[PDB]
Amino acid sequence: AEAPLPQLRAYTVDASWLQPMAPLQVADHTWQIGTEDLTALLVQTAEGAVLLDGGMPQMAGHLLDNMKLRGVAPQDLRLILLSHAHADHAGPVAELKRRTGAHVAANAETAVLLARGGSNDLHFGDGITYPPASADRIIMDGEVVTVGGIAFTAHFMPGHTPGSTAWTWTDTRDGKPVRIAYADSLSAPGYQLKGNPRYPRLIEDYKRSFATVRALPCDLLLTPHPGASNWNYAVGSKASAEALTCNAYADAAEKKFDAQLARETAGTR
Amino acid sequence: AEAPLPQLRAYTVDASWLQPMAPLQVADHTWQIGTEDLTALLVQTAEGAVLLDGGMPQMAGHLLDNMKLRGVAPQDLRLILLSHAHADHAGPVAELKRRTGAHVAANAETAVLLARGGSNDLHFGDGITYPPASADRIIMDGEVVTVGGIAFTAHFMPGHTPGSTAWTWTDTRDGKPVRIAYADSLSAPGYQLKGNPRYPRLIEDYKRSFATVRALPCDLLLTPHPGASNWNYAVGSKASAEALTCNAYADAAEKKFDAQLARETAGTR
Amino acid sequence: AEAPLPQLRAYTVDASWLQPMAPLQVADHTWQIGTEDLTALLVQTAEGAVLLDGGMPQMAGHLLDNMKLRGVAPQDLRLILLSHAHADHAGPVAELKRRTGAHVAANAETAVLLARGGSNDLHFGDGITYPPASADRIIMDGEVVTVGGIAFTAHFMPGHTPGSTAWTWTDTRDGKPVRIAYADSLSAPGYQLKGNPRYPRLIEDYKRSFATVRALPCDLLLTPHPGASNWNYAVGSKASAEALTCNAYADAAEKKFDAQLARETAGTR
Amino acid sequence: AEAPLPQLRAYTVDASWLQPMAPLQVADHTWQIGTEDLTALLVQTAEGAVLLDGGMPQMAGHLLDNMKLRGVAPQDLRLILLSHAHADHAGPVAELKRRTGAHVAANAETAVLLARGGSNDLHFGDGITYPPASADRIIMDGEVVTVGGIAFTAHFMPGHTPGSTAWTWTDTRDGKPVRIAYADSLSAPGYQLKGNPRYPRLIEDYKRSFATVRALPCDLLLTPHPGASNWNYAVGSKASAEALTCNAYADAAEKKFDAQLARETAGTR
Lengths: 269, 269, 269, 269
Ligand SMILES: C[C@H](CS)C(=O)N1CCC[C@H]1C(=O)O
Ligand SMILES: C[C@H](CS)C(=O)N1CCC[C@H]1C(=O)O
Ligand SMILES: C[C@H](CS)C(=O)N1CCC[C@H]1C(=O)O
Ligand SMILES: C[C@H](CS)C(=O)N1CCC[C@H]1C(=O)O
Ligand SMILES: C[C@H](CS)C(=O)N1CCC[C@H]1C(=O)O
Ligand SMILES: C[C@H](CS)C(=O)N1CCC[C@H]1C(=O)O
Ligand SMILES: C[C@H](CS)C(=O)N1CCC[C@H]1C(=O)O
Ligand SMILES: C[C@H](CS)C(=O)N1CCC[C@H]1C(=O)O
Ligand SMILES: [Zn+2]
Ligand SMILES: [Zn+2]
Ligand SMILES: [Zn+2]
Ligand SMILES: [Zn+2]
Ligand SMILES: [Zn+2]
Ligand SMILES: [Zn+2]
Ligand SMILES: [Zn+2]
Ligand SMILES: [Zn+2]
Description:
Chains A, B, C, D: Zn(2+) 3 binds at residues 88-89, 225. Chains A, B, C, D: One of its GO terms (biological process) is antibiotic catabolic process. Chains A, B, C, D: Its main location: periplasm. Chains A, B, C, D: Zn(2+) 1 binds at residues 84, 86, 88, 160. The structure is a homotetramer. In chain A, the strands form 2 sheets. Chain A has a 7-stranded mixed sheet with strand order 1-2-3-4-5-6-7. Chain A has a 5-stranded mixed sheet with strand order 8-9-10-11-12. Chain A has a single domain (1-269), classed as Ribonuclease Z/Hydroxyacylglutathione hydrolase-like (Metallo-beta-lactamase, Chain A, 4-Layer Sandwich). Chain A has helices spanning 60-69, 87-90, 93-100, 108-115, 202-214, 246-265, and strands at residues 24-25, 30-32, 41-45, 48-52, 77-81, 103-106, 137-138, 144-147, 150-156, 165-173, 176-182, 220-222. Chain A is an alpha/beta fold. The radius of gyration of chain A is 18 Å and the shape is globular. Chains in contact: A-B, A-C, A-D, B-C, B-D, C-D. Chain B binds chain D through residues 47-48, 75, 78, 97-98, 101-103, 134, 136-137, and chain D through 47-48, 75, 78, 97-98, 101-103, 134, 136-137. One zinc ion binds next to helix 2 of chain C. One L-captopril sits between chains D (111, 134-136, 138) and A (112, 115-116, 120).
């Protein structure tokens, strides 16, 4: 009686990443509409809405529910933007496109990973996947995408994925501008950093990306994993109280990266 | 403490579907190289090999091992053909393409489902998925694909999937021709047959496909699930003893389909 | 001084195919907005517009101009449907998608040809091409697509292309229903009909498609080339006067097909 | 009698770009097999051949002819690499893939442009297009691709296109190593350089790419347009005599770029 091949293993996550929350207002037009521990930002304009990230694949219905609470019908969603195309951020994109008619704008690296459904990941292989989706517009570094007069600027910050992107826009609160920076992850979870044949310039890209994050226009920083920027979505009006600056987020990420690099030289993860 | 969204659920299968077996010769050039309960046929020519189906995603390494036992190095695999693009038959195609340089030939319906990784299935939704892969050649009904002088003919038999295909070729044994028919599944597992908005002509297609299977050139029938044609790969040289004819396979499938249709009218699965 | 390789040759067409016209009303909601000799139908609903075909690639701006004359802003175009994915009918689809955010719904055969930009055509090779575009929804035979409460039904009629489709919907005029049938081309221009290795069942498909066209619900027939159904868009309110029935269109196409088949047997085009 | 829309215009080129030539040996394994004025490099190994660029779409048959003269049958072509995905360098890729079974390896930017057939170009729009093709392997900056033991290293040099790549490998001649650098174009033909909304960091990318080219391992430089590196393929064994170094090629390109930038500030092309 010899061993059969192993069964496929599902991508399972902490319960808080799947815990629905009601819409939490970030600025006049901008709302967190994902789960307690995964960001999905809805930006509402007079000419339709923009969604930045959707979380896990199973979050599609919840996102549509929260859009409805905000007055956004499915067909009112015009545009989906992404931080990076891993299953816990781009998971429901294919379903959202089918149910809303929204288009996706992303850089070429994010587009190719999204079209693979996250398979053949440089570090994860086929372990963390989701339904594939197509990008409808390819964007370049620094390119501006505008919906309802609100301009979103892309800032490439490769490392966590080759296509990792920060998005910036200026909202308002109390009559004053609020420069929002939605910066992507700077983690390298389980990654081989040095001499990686699938990503030879990984270290150089991360190092440049720390600098890119430090330089973002940033009155208020948000991140795909809210804990990375010290947000606590579950506490409502105090959710943003402890939020990091872009400088502090980059500094923390670089210290962690440097320590991980030294541990890899020392033979451990 | 309210319920979080459910975790993703992996596509799990009976252990026998994942139980490796050594190559089992079907005819002079044709070998079963999959698992005990999933067909993957290797056809070896003087100018490279053809693979018809690969089974589950986790079978890629085993298939390459069996190819090596047959004298087929990875780069010797020229062509992948498919019965249908469900995860338990097309599962390892993307990985095989990357590791062998083989091309995929398939009809348009199979190509679109394969490129989705089986997501947005007409009946399964996103429940049964696999790494997406691209077809390199689109084939039409009755089209002949030739490798090393061996001609493979496609016979469309829509129903189980819109792109379901039977493949026929003539091998030899004991100096005599053996017309092999690799006919696709004719099951409708859990499908809504009547008035299905995603497949309005489902019943008409199945009915035509029973006739197509009856008419195949067929000295020896094989099926993606070997039990459907009464093969038992685990018993070696007796594996083919009880194999059905194409007529008998079509008849059994049609009786099951008609009974399921009546049960659906009677309100049950 | 030996001959260089030939220059690329552009797909050039009769001037009337490129001659802009103002919107011509077909029924209460339905307008011809293409050129004098290429159909592009705009169907306007309370929840956005549908475009059936766009003509040649250079027609994108003209279509948007005519949409504006009808009160349809670019973002109001929700859906693009196609008769078949040749350059003179799907030509501007990629550009329209980028400028409107519309989605494309098409069958798998049309989707694969559209994604090739018409290249590797079964009969034309690479001679007649256009910017590639992706389908966003794959439709099956008989499937209903609804926008603003108006239901469009797909009727597959393979032959002219494998993915050739007739679209039907019911509009109104003078308080009475008008069953509109937009039937695809039934021509085989320069095609090898018999024993075509790239389309082995071509004759069988055309023969079935003549029957499909005869059976369409049809108070008013329109065709991608208006002359094929005896429309004359240039004469305004008399444009539809001489229009054929579906029965007469199918009969004329079948007689032409049978004559061409006999000429092919007799060695001529 | 008002003007019809303009006819489509073919991409026409100088006759020398389409003038076939016999294979010209560059090093022990490496041959120029394109036309007098467009590079297409064949690298022949014990385990199959690599093609770097193919020229214009109409060059497919000529390339296959020259491969045959070199002893390379169609199925012996294993891999296609590209400098950049414009019609005059990637033109015949789709056809070559269909006729050889070769795979394409390219970066994400090149993959997305190739899959568009060069349409929606950042600078050319839809004016310069070719049959779309899919990449089979996505490569990263500095990644090594190996065929028959010969290692090809990718060096990203964005500017002329976002995906512009230099490829390096070490061949031999007279028992000594020859480090070959196939560097992409550094021209900006008709491009808006400053404040280009579709390429906001164009100038920064070109400036970094001049430095990348200067730093390439380079005993012998070749370029997609041979005149850019002072090759003259038509003079046979003297073809390489006047070839530039990488330093000189970068310097000439940067001086031209700086002059064009000043002219753009001065309001001219
Ligand atoms: C695989 C692609 C996304 S990358 C997809 O979902 N498509 C491509 C064509 C239509 C639609 C579908 O199959 O439903
Ligand atoms: C959180 C990341 C995605 S940003 C992830 O999925 N990881 C991190 C490494 C492994 C894998 C997992 O959770 O299983
Ligand atoms: C999503 C497609 C298959 S349908 C894919 O895997 N591609 C497309 C381009 C290259 C390669 C890859 O991303 O590795
Ligand atoms: C055997 C089929 C594929 S041919 C399958 O995966 N089924 C049948 C219906 C449900 C699902 C499952 O096993 O979970
Ligand atoms: C080639 C595809 C259509 S079949 C395309 O245009 N795409 C695919 C991703 C984004 C967009 C683009 O490149 O502009
Ligand atoms: C009218 C058809 C498309 S429906 C066409 O483009 N043809 C017909 C055959 C040749 C080619 C041409 O006009 O050059
Ligand atoms: C459009 C793609 C290349 S990007 C293509 O040619 N395909 C995709 C599937 C098969 C093959 C074909 O249609 O011939
Ligand atoms: C030589 C370049 C491609 S590298 C080209 O095609 N150009 C340069 C600008 C215009 C266009 C043309 O020849 O028409
Ligand atoms: Zn991630
Ligand atoms: Zn994550
Ligand atoms: Zn199945
Ligand atoms: Zn199965
Ligand atoms: Zn046509
Ligand atoms: Zn036409
Ligand atoms: Zn170029
Ligand atoms: Zn060029």
